């Protein structure tokens, strides 16, 4: 035996170590066959629209249009106010602001106190 390779989010399972591929069934073979059939109809359509002499433009890609539209213009109409979404938005958009406000206010309060008590040594501080 040998120690087991543990897959992670950023280091995924190798193709040759998947237990799923070795469980072969006629249903699985049919699934792979129809997957490659879909791939082949896509490839045939692309090559037919590709090798035509008449065409002198961009081949418009439905997949890319779907990708872009889903990324940009489909977000808000499908949004729903949920505890997860509301809490995440409030945290990530509100907490950093108050955190930085606290940091800067504390630093400037300390600096102003040091100013009033006179021990800051601002000799040669001419440009501000």
């Amino acid at each position: 035996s040998f120690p087991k390779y543990k897959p992670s989010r950023l280091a995924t399972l190798p193709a040759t170590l998947d237990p799923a591929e070795y469980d072969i069934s006629p249903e699985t073979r049919k699934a792979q066959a129809e997957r490659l059939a879909i791939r082949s109809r896509l490839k045939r359509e692309y090559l037919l629209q590709y090798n035509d002499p008449n065409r002198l433009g961009v081949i418009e890609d439905p997949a890319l249009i779907r990708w872009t539209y889903a990324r940009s213009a489909n977000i808000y109409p499908n949004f729903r106010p949920t505890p997860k979404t509301s809490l995440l938005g409030a945290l990530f958009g509100i907490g950093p602001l108050f955190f930085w406000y606290y940091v800067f206010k504390t630093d400037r309060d300390k600096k102003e106190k040091l100013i009033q008590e006179g021990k800051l040594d601002q000799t040669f501080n001419i440009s501000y």
């Binding site: 629209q49 002198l56 433009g57 890319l64 872009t68 930085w100 940091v103 800067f104 440009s127 501000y128």
Partner: protein, 459 residues
């Protein structure tokens, strides 16, 4: 000052009575001449100002913006010359009329001895831009964009007007000179707090502030190339000019009141610079980059120190030029591919090498490479913020790193790699586009020789 306003007004007669095929040439030549005339205002004094009359005055903050405004119009004409080829002469003349009206309104806005006149012209600049975006825009969402680009401003602008009239009832004048010379401290009261907010928010929304920056990507993506140029180059600088002019009365309340906006800008510059990394669109990416730069300018204005103001002025000018150039490059890509997405048209350097050089120069100058004036303004603002508080340097350094990252990402995705195979309709770059990019970039590298021309009245 009328020696600049009158020829700009006479441009309208010149275009409408022009021959049906000579509109572009005449407009370009006379716009360049008007830019040459407007160059005369650069001779400023270390004294008060150039008080031409009771109605108009010029300043070393107003003069660079005026020169940039006059200089942008020929570039806008040359850029829009292409995609308006299949339009009736009446509609092209209307387009040029809108451009001249916008330049005239900006010219009158930047002198504006009085605050109410400044507000009136500053709000009149909205209408021709709205018409250009909504009428000569491509997609269907442009109307929505217009509504956004309108109502935000108006929601921001209305309290300001009220504040303005209130001030005139208490102070008795709204002229800049009397306001500066008779300025009195503002007692820390609720009424003074609301006056401060009303005076500041109108300009803050147009910068835009990080919270209120929703409108800018929509407006940039939907506008034609001329609209994008004028919005990125000048129309964002109106907020900076207004805040710089109006902060004089707001002291000493500024120190207490500025904290929320300072935090918003300092965090939002990081947020939008990071947003730029994951973007599938050119115009959206450049819009977010503009948001980052204007957030830095907001920080500079709020800090209210001499170095802050000098850096903010230099950064405003530099960002205007750079963003206009970048939008020109993106539109050059769009008019060829008709897609407006980064990942489709790729590896263009093998196919358009000189345009690749233009892309590289624009990316470098957006990256704030020394000794370009972009870096001059960036460094002045960074030093002023460090003097304000020593912790700010962390955020500034993060912003600089992410800025370099996304600028080089935008260069890499479009120019390097392997070309998309099925694309074939890409023609070699015309002389018009190359001249456009050259006229965009040469003034920047000429201005870095004389930075004191664009460092404002606190130089």
């Amino acid at each position: 000052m009328l020696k600049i306003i009158i020829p700009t007004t006479m441009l309208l007669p010149m275009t409408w009575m022009s021959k049906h095929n000579m509109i572009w040439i005449n407009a370009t030549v006379h716009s360049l001449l008007i830019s040459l005339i407007s160059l005369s205002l650069l001779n400023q004094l270390g004294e008060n100002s150039l008080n031409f009359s009771l109605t108009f005055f010029s300043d070393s903050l107003s003069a660079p913006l005026l020169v940039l405004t006059t200089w942008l119009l020929p570039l806008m004409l040359m850029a829009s010359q292409s995609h308006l080829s299949k339009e009736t002469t009446t509609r092209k003349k209307l387009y040029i009329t809108m451009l001249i009206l916008l330049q005239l309104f900006l010219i009158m806005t930047f002198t504006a001895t009085e605050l109410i006149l400044f507000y009136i012209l500053f709000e009149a600049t909205l209408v021709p831009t709205l018409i250009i975006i909504t009428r000569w825009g491509n997609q269907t969402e442009r109307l929505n964009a217009g509504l956004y680009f309108l109502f935000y401003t108006l929601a921001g602008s209305l309290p300001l007007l009220v504040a303005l009239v209130y001030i005139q009832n208490t102070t008795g004048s709204l002229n800049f000179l009397i306001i500066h010379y008779w300025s009195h401290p503002l007692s820390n009261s609720w009424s003074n707090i609301f006056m401060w907010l009303a005076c500041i928010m109108a300009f803050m929304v147009k910068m835009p502030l990080y919270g209120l920056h929703l409108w800018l990507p929509k407006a940039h993506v939907e506008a034609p190339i001329a609209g994008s140029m004028v919005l990125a180059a000048v129309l964002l600088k109106l907020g900076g000019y207004g805040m710089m002019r109006i902060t004089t009365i707001l002291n000493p309340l500024t120190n207490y009141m500025a904290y929320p906006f300072l935090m918003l800008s300092m965090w939002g510059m990081i947020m939008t610079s990071s947003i730029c990394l994951r973007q599938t669109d050119l115009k959206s990416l450049i819009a977010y980059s503009s948001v980052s730069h204007m957030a830095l300018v907001i920080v500079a204005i709020m800090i209210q120190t001499p170095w802050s103001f000098m850096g903010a002025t230099a950064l405003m000018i530099a960002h205007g030029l750079t963003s206009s150039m970048l939008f020109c490059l993106a539109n050059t890509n769009y008019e060829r591919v008709h897609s407006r997405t980064m990942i489709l048209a790729r590896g263009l350097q093998t196919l358009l090498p000189l345009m690749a050089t233009w892309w590289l120069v624009a990316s470098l100058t957006n990256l704030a490479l020394p000794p370009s004036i972009n870096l001059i303004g960036e460094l002045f603002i960074i030093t002023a913020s460090f003097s304000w508080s020593n912790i700010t340097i962390i955020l500034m350094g993060m912003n600089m790193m992410i800025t370099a990252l996304y600028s080089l990402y935008m260069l890499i995705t479009t120019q390097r790699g392997k070309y998309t195979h099925h694309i074939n309709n890409i023609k070699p770059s015309f002389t018009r586009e190359n001249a456009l990019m050259a006229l965009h970039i040469l003034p920047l590298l000429l201005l870095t020789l004389n930075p004191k021309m664009i460092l404002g009245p606190l130089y």
